[PDB]
Ligand binder design. Structure first.
Ligand SMILES: [Mn+2]
Ligand SMILES: [Mn+2]
Ligand SMILES: [Mn+2]
Lengths: 439, 439, 439
């Protein structure tokens, strides 16, 4: 009776463990970082494959930019075929895998609460198991913990593939966030500061372990992802060779990245299925890829040139006594609100213009502000002055405890929030900290 | 032919009337107000049970706060089992009952128009009857009439369970809104001003008449609802005993209420199914309830403390000649826009702080304003000065006919709207009315 | 084998061509413009009928105002019955036709990207062919081309039924946009400037060619559409007679139009199915139509009167030396934000008031502005001064290249956008251009 069913179940669990084990397929490039991450990469692939083979649903959340979309689509491309080979139902693909972008740089409560409500409905209504959750290009920080506390109330297992700094280290290779997730694939564990190995690179390698058969289809994705995130990693320069083999040079890759970020701005919370795959060149439909990229890119380029031409006259640029070129722009007063490009993207376009004119290695700091936020971008040259945005933000919060100062990101790129009524004081204090920097 | 079908239909209608009659199960507490409301309570339960037994769908709309969610979930908990016992289809639960929160304190046109479009699709596409509409913690005022005029164009029957003042009385126990709905359960009909018998209390009692079998599961809900709405009713202090029996003390209840209001802020238009039931302790899954409340509450507490610490230095507090402590805070300039806590919730947190420091019975008036709105909170002590927000709003509208003044709510708690360009004049006139109050 | 299937397919294509041919049913009114548009009208109907007969889905996009809704519903009313007669499945109606409003006056990227994602899902998941796309009261301009470039990457066929000026003419009867669509029905091709033959007029005639059987049901729709768009066309005054036959006088039509624009404001991205048909009087349910229009219209009228009374004292009206009456109103400072009526609608209500008081033929220019936009309305009297908004906008952009000036619309009605920080300069320059106009 129950003994028959239990003994058969126990054997099924064991055979699932065995079949889920990924092969050691190595990597597409040479990298000591990837080699050091191999055990966690193989564990991630094991967990994903096991969910697939047991008919458990998967939710894949990814950040909504080129690197994130590329990473998410890499994983989807490996997963879907496996789901289709083991499922009798042709609806299984659509039902047992969901990809959802996150516009925020962390797993927002609105996102996780939606994921929980949706998964609980499928559970109660159709008897589905609760899903494996895979978070990509997000998830590896302390800001993600609130979401994970909620998922753990449901016994949900969680895979993270990210390349942002977890920051709060509890040991040499363990961060605070790691206690709330089951496997965390992140270069920062094996080499602190190695942001340049991006989510799309990591995710493509994980995807190869999940399903070695999709290698040839996706091996160029890391070049697209690295272009999106502007990686200067030795791994990236190897990954580029796979794109070249398919006829994509470096300018092609840049156009593709710009197209993805533009289209994703407009489709918002939708996932771009039916479009993103064509842009990323993972279907055999070369003509549709060309029509999309050649149709869209000129439009994107023209918008950027138009907005730059109109906004640039309002950018104040001063060379400070220490040699720093400090640029400021009020993107509430002198930018089109709610339109492409967003303040973040606009600040990048302005910053790039100053880099093209004066050089990336010149010390350039671009501050783009609204009523209650500022986006900050620092050229590589700012490293010569030990510019660290996180340190400056902590300083500002301590000097102005009533101004609601918050944020940061990278030491060289990120954003600040503050109370609108204390903007003048916060930004003047920010400027004083920049003046005081020493070579 | 048609005579066979018609005679059988007529007998089915009569047996439906008979079976729908609820038993007189009394109440969970002693209350002359509930006793006086019994006929309408029994009518509400009759209408709901009848819809269920005829296979008619039900839409339940409720305000999106602790009292409203609690009330809605109380009713759902009684209804779903009955639907499942009479329906052959296991999809009947999901199809023939819908719970939809309303963030507005009235049945907004966007909500009712969506309800009508959705119900008309089910009608035309699947042949469903048009639903019984049950509105809870909303619906009992003149601001709800526009929605009801639209529903009545479709011959829809409407149950209202609310505890806000209908205001526009046409007789001793009948208000203007009552002409547009089929049964209105509201303590104000039998005892004017008795707001402290809240929707979750009322709805739990209605739920017991709908389905006496769920009594033990939901009899603690009124304690949660009353905590959310800060009821000081004699009924509330009895209802608390049912929560104590299940191990929930008064601090537990407060944490639960704070958790609901926090989570509901983030899930927005979603209904929280799969989560809210766990927080409200109506499943047997004690561990999940604990993980959610103990996981979430510290996070909620920390956000409130952080925001309070940052905002408090910007609150102006003056004791006026008449003894009133008048607090003002610009929540556009000195609060985080679009984040938890909302302006309404923030004003409450600031107001509570002033109450803790100076006492609830001291006369405290907290005015939190943005560009074009203000939230007003008056301590019990303000009653000694005959403070009435609705009267003050009428005065302001008459003195400043070009300023677009509108709103009110309770005599002691509510909000004003006005034209941004007349803010100074409106708020200075508001302050003069407060100065002129006499003990 | 493949020869059997291919020969049968070829014959099916030929019989589809034959059956899709519409009858020459003439028109409901006398019109040289319609006569000149007949070949394109018949082509539009051919393409729509062919899609229906082959079981291809149709997406109908329309602008979200009275004229657009009326046009969309006219076409839906003709299409649905044909779909139902040729489809075995009773779900075919719901699956093979979709009507989606567009709030923007062009085919926005957010709309088209959603259409592409949705159509690609149906394609991949259910094997549906890609749809015929029909755009109505939008689509006939250069601002629509980006959407069409994306649709053409998927080989999608596109029908446009619009009455806005394509502007960018490449020959006498061909505009730039025409290269991206398969048939464009627009009076401007055969008579430049003939905006007064509106989308609902055009669409009703197309609908008659699609399905002559629905003529009697929809022949009054053009009167509603023309009322919404305030057409003074000779065709309109004929179309009115069909409304009179059904008991709708000119005041009834105005109430209907005001009701549609009000309700559509609140249901937003939803399509109003189950409601709009009743308001438009195309069902046999006269009582529901009456309850909706008589229930809703007084509420609409009261809102307009209330807002007008409160806002009018803030309108500055000056008669300029040249005789022009120039009205200005700051609708950010002195109007209710986010509520009915929108800035566009509010400007119309203010403008109408000035027209009622001083006459339509008096030269009246109403400028309603926010932080970063302005809505402009010119009475017929402004024609005596050669007022052209598009020319003025070009002038402003050239004089103020750093102010981000954009927009236009009609020579007499439209809107400008600009950078908030250059508002003063843009509006003062706008006012100088108006001062300089000569009779
Ligand atoms: Mn990345
Ligand atoms: Mn309540
Ligand atoms: Mn139109």
């Amino acid at each position: 009776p129950g003994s028959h069913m239990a003994e058969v179940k126990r054997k099924i669990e064991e055979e699932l463990d065995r079949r889920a084990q990924p092969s050691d397929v190595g990597f597409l490039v040479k990298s000591e970082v990837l080699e050091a991450l191999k055990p966690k990469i193989m564990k991630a692939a094991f967990m994903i494959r096991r969910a697939i083979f047991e008919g458990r649903p998967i939710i894949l959340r990814h950040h909504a930019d080129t690197d994130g979309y590329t990473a998410g689509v890499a994983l989807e491309t490996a997963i879907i075929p496996l789901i289709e080979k083991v499922a009798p139902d042709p609806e299984a693909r659509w039902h047992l895998f969901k990809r959802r972008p996150s516009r925020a740089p962390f797993y927002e409560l609105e996102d996780v609460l939606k994921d929980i409500i949706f998964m609980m409905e499928d559970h109660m209504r159709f008897g589905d198991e609760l899903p494996l959750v895979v978070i990509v290009d997000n998830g590896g920080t302390t800001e993600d913990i609130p979401a994970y506390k909620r998922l753990k109330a449901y016994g949900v297992k969680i895979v993270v593939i990210d390349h942002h700094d977890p920051r709060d280290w509890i040991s040499e290779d363990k961060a605070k966030v790691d206690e709330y997730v089951d496997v965390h694939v992140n270069p920062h564990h094996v080499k602190r500061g190695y942001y340049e190995l991006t989510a799309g690179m990591l995710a493509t390698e994980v995807a190869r372990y999940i399903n070695p058969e999709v290698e040839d289809r996706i091996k160029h994705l890391p070049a697209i992802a690295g272009t999106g995130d502007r990686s200067k990693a030795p791994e990236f320069y190897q990954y580029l060779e796979y794109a070249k083999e398919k006829g994509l040079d470096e300018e092609d890759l840049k156009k593709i990245a710009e197209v993805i970020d533009h289209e994703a701005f407009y489709w918002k919370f939708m996932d771009g299925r039916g479009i993103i795959e064509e842009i990323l060149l993972i279907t055999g439909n070369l003509q549709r890829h060309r029509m999309l990229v050649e149709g869209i890119y000129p439009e994107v380029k023209e918008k950027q040139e138009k907005v730059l031409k109109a906004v640039l006259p309002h950018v104040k640029s001063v060379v400070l006594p220490n040699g720093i070129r400090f640029n400021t722009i009020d993107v509430e007063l002198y930018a089109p609100k709610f339109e492409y490009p967003s303040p973040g993207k606009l600040s990048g376009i302005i910053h790039d213009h100053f880099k093209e004119q004066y050089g990336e290695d010149s010390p350039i700091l671009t501050l783009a502000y609204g009523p209650d936020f500022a986006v900050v971008r620092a050229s590589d040259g700012m490293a010569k002055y030990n510019f660290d945005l996180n340190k400056i933000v902590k300083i500002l919060a301590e000097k102005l405890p009533d101004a609601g100062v918050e944020g940061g990101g990278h030491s060289y790129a990120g954003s600040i929030k503050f109370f609108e009524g204390k903007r003048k004081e916060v930004l003047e204090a920010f400027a004083k900290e920049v003046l005081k920097l020493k070579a």
